[PDB]
Design a protein around this ligand. Structure first.
Ligand SMILES: CCCCC/C=C\C\C=C/C=C/C=C/C[C@@H](O)CCCC(=O)O
Length: 295
């Protein structure tokens, strides 16, 4: 439309969300994480198969609507960061071509895993350069592109910095609160945050993502109320939904869910080993990072 390359934060989001959605719980967690951290598509079972599908989909190498590997996106991803990665054009073309040969078949987890596996085995190092899959390589991207939300920085803090960048004092100067002012700066900050938390994207509202945040604070029973509050909200801007949630019977639960996501948005590894404890613990953890917490 044309296709837009993914930055380091966008790639990190894909990796961490796929870990969250595919890592097993219990003793098996460490085993899979050790292999996947090393970029090994092992073991050869359904857990890894669907993890692979998740990452291919998130990096937009696989398109689920077309059920197709999108070979021509690889050179686009390369071109966007080539001065930083120093990846070789010859190898990029070879990677593109290997993807063009790949057969998605049904698009099932195993079909995509089987098709992608030899491509991965051949081009793993290049793929980690192109898609910001090394700590050192990603660091170069953040250093060259200060406009990307950094690791350790919450979306709320990143967005605050860009919403209040003039003479007017930030509404969150003493710490972020839930005061509803309807100011242009607050509306901007909230739009930036909703997009950063994947509550909204270019296709609009993601009701399921907001529900996920309530599930993550152990409030699964509130799902129908979360859906109802969003559904009855007049207006379709991020700020409108935020106002609807804050002014509803869900108020305190939303604050807890949104605050927990602030923490998680600063530390993309947070859930990958820790679970939700309580609001006071969240606040203490946020003090260690670049967040909008009260000190
Ligand atoms: C490039 C397409 C790969 C599709 C195959 C599916 C998964 C690849 C395997 C493992 C991925 C592990 C991702 C770990 C995240 C890590 O690489 C992020 C490093 C950057 C950072 O931590 O700052």
């Amino acid at each position: 439309q044309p296709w837009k390359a993914l930055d380091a934060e966008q790639a990190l989001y894909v990796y961490k969300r796929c870990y969250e959605d595919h890592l097993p719980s219990g003793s098996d967690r460490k085993t899979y994480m050790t292999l996947w951290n090393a970029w090994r598509l092992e073991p050869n079972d359904a857990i890894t198969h669907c993890y692979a599908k998740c990452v291919l989909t998130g990096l937009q190498i696989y398109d689920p609507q077309e059920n197709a590997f999108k070979s021509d996106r690889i050179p686009v991803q390369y071109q966007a960061y080539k001065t930083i990665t120093q990846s070789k054009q010859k190898e990029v073309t070879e990677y593109q071509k290997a993807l063009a040969a790949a057969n998605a078949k049904s698009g099932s987890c195993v079909d995509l895993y089987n098709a992608y596996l030899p491509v991965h085995n051949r081009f793993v190092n290049l793929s980690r350069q192109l898609y910001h899959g090394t700590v050192e390589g990603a660091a170069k991207i953040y250093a060259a592109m200060p406009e990307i939300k950094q690791k350790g920085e919450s979306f709320h803090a990143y967005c605050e910095k860009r919403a209040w960048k003039g003479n007017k004092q930030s509404e969150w100067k003493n710490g972020r609160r839930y005061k509803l002012t309807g100011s242009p700066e607050l509306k901007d900050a909230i739009d930036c945050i909703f997009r950063g938390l994947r509550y909204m994207d270019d296709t609009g509202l993601k009701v399921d993502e907001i529900v996920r945040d309530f599930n993550l604070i152990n409030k699964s029973e509130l799902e129908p109320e979360v859906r109802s509050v969003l559904a009855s909200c007049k207006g379709s801007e991020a700020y409108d939904y935020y106002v609807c949630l804050v002014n509803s019977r869900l108020k305190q639960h939303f604050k807890n869910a949104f605050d927990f996501h602030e923490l998680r948005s600063a530390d993309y590894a947070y859930l990958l080993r820790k679970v939700y404890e309580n609001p006071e613990k969240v606040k203490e953890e946020m003090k260690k990072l670049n967040t909008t917490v009260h000190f």
